[PDB]
Structure formats: structure tokens, C-alpha cells
Amino acid sequence: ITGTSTVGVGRGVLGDQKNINTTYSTYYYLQDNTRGNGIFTYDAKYRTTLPGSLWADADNQFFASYDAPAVDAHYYAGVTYDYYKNVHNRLSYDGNNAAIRSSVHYSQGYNNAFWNGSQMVYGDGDGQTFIPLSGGIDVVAHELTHAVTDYTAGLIYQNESGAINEAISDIFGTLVEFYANKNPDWEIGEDVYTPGISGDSLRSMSDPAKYGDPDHYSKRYTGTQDNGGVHINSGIINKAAYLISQGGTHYGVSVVGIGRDKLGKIFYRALTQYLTPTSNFSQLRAAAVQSATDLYGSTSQEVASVKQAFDAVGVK
Ligand SMILES: [Ca+2]
Ligand SMILES: [Ca+2]
Ligand SMILES: [Ca+2]
Ligand SMILES: [Ca+2]
Ligand SMILES: [Zn+2]
């Protein structure tokens, strides 16, 4: 809508207070005009019809419990936009400041979130397995990263290329979590998963096998579930990325860590410059080595650590 930019205040899913960019025109709308062509948050009103109604509020205060998922979807979309702009010089997901749209309150008791090809969508969860999914910044950044991947490499959502697609979203979801820097970790979804059980998460990058996911190529899933295991075999790549950053010895192979910032730079370059829709794990390794070479030289520690990380997980 057309109106006056302003700043409102609200409470997110976890009860934390934050400021949000809104637009005023009779009502106050969740429309942030300060980032590219805008960030827009919609109410799907417990239906599956999308996008729903652009979120309108009478007083620019968002403290009602119904408000919380919208506050967080709106605010964390902004953080993610800032991460891509400030760190990788990328303007929104298409690189040309496309408007970012999110809908919340999708369906009833819906235990997931997703990018549908044009916007992000967030369920409220059933209160048992999940609380509203926009409450996790790693979850928001994961979904928005699918949009980035679709506009760049275009990795098909099947088999190895699909597992790479998933790992990239987990990797950048985590890097964005570290960017915002409130209790960052190498786990996925811990803020919104199983409110009744502390210390768990949906996936682990530091130790995928904790939840039964493979951490070595020899343990890859070869069946047909989950589109050929796109959320399962991602653990192999997530472990590689964790090792490149933090270091460690894994199946007897030692890796010198080079830290998060270099991990992000290498993987972003691989994504945007070298990966293609049908890239497999071996092609990821080659793309990552070539990226690190481009940035730091063929005889760098950086190139060395990428090679050892991929050897450690069994990807040749
Ligand atoms: Ca209000
Ligand atoms: Ca965390
Ligand atoms: Ca996390
Ligand atoms: Ca939990
Ligand atoms: Zn995903």
C-alpha cells in the first residue's frame, strides 16, 4: 500500500520485544519500505489460500498473541535481507531487490514452513511438536535461502542436487543466526521445535547422526522417501560445512577450521558462480575447491581445509 513509513513495536513468539518497520495509511501495515522494494507480511487466517491479507493493525502495537508469528516473520525477513546485503552484496533473493512476502497462520496445526516459489509460508505448529515456525531465525533464513538458490544455481529438489539445495539453506540459516548473534548454534530449529523438551532440535550440523542423519557419504540414503532423502543426506554436506568452519577430526581425518566468514564466502561463490541445477556432491566439492582457490589461492590453508573436510565426509 502507499503510505508513511514508521516504526511499531511488538512481541515475538518467544516473548521478546522488538521494533518493526511498518507503513501507515489509516491502518498500520506490516510493510517495511526501508529494504529494497519492500518486506510484506500477510495473514492467512488459518486457511491455505495465499497470500491472505496484508497484515493491518489499528495502533502500531503488536502485543497480542495472534500477532507474534507476524512480528517475527516480518522482523527476521529483514535481518536475513540485511545479512545478504551487508555480507554478500546481494540485494534481496533475485539480486535486484525483489519484494519479500511472507504469510503466517497458514492452515491449522501446520507443523512446517516453506518457500512456495513466490513467497514464504509459516504454519503455527500444533503446540506440541512445534510452536509458530517464524519464531526461529534459522528457520526463516533457511526458507528465504531457497529463494536465493532458485534464482542462482537452481538446484533441482531431488536426490543429491536436492540434498545440496537443503544443506545450503541450513548453512546460510545458521550463518544468519550467527549474524544476528542471539544464542547462535549449529543446530536447526531449536527455538521452535518441541517446546516441552529442552536441548533438542530438528537437525544438527555439528553432529547430524544425533538424529539419525548421515555424516558420511557411505551412509547416504538411497531410497525414494523425502524426494530421495533431500532432508536426510543434507547431513553429509552440513557436517562438511561445520568442519570447514570449526575444524575437528571426523572418521580419522583432521580438518583445520577457517571460521564462519570464510565458510560463507566460499559457499556463496560456489552457489552463485559454479553450481548448476543437476550438480551432485562430487561437483559441489569441485565447486567449493575452485571457489576457495579463486578467493585465497591454490596453495592456501583455505583450499586445504575444504579438501580435508570433504575427504572426512567421504565425498571425492
Ligand atoms: Ca495492535
Ligand atoms: Ca539458537
Ligand atoms: Ca539454530
Ligand atoms: Ca525442544
Ligand atoms: Zn529446505
The full set of domain ranges for the chain reads 6-154, 155-315
Is 177 strand, coil or helix? helix
246 neighbors 309 (Cβ within 8 angstroms): no
Buried b or exposed e, range 164-182, using 16+ CB within 10 angstroms:
bbbbbbbbbbbbbbbbbee
Tell me: cis bond preceding 277? Omega within 30 of 0 counts: no
Asked if domains 6-154 and 155-315 share a fold, the reply is no
**Is 177 annotated among the ligand-binding residues?**
yes
Rounded distance, CA 30 to CA 38, Å? 10
Cα(166) to centroid(ligand 5), Å: 5
- Please state, in angstroms and as integers, the Cα–Cα distance from residue 292 to each residue in 206, 263, 289, 303, 310, following that order: 22, 9, 5, 5, 13
Residue found by looking up cell 540414503 in the block: 221
246 Cα to the center of ligand 4, angstroms: 25
311/199 Cα distance (integer angstroms)? 30
Scanning the chain, the segments in alpha helix (DSSP H) are: 68-88, 137-151, 159-180, 225-229, 234-246, 260-269, 281-296, 301-312
CB contact at 8 A, 96 and 41: no
Q: Report helix, strand or coil for 124.
A: coil
CATH class of 155-315: mainly alpha
143 is catalytic: yes
Q: Is 302 a catalytic residue?
A: no
Q: How far apart are CA 187 and CA 275, in angstroms?
A: 25
Report yes or no: 153 and 277 within 8 Å, Cβ to Cβ. yes
Does the annotation list 146 as a binding residue? yes
Q: Which three cell numbers stand for residue 301?
A: 590453508
The cell for 148 is 536465493
What cell was used for 51? 497470500
Resolution (angstroms) stands at 2.1
Q: Is 97 annotated as a binding residue?
A: no
Query: What is 6-154's CATH number, 3.30.300.130, 3.40.50.2300, 3.40.50.1100, 3.10.170.10?
Result: 3.10.170.10
The method of structure determination was X-ray
- Whole-angstrom distance, CA of residue 142 vs CA of residue 172: 7
**What is the Cα–Cα distance from 9 to 71, expressed in whole angstroms?**
9
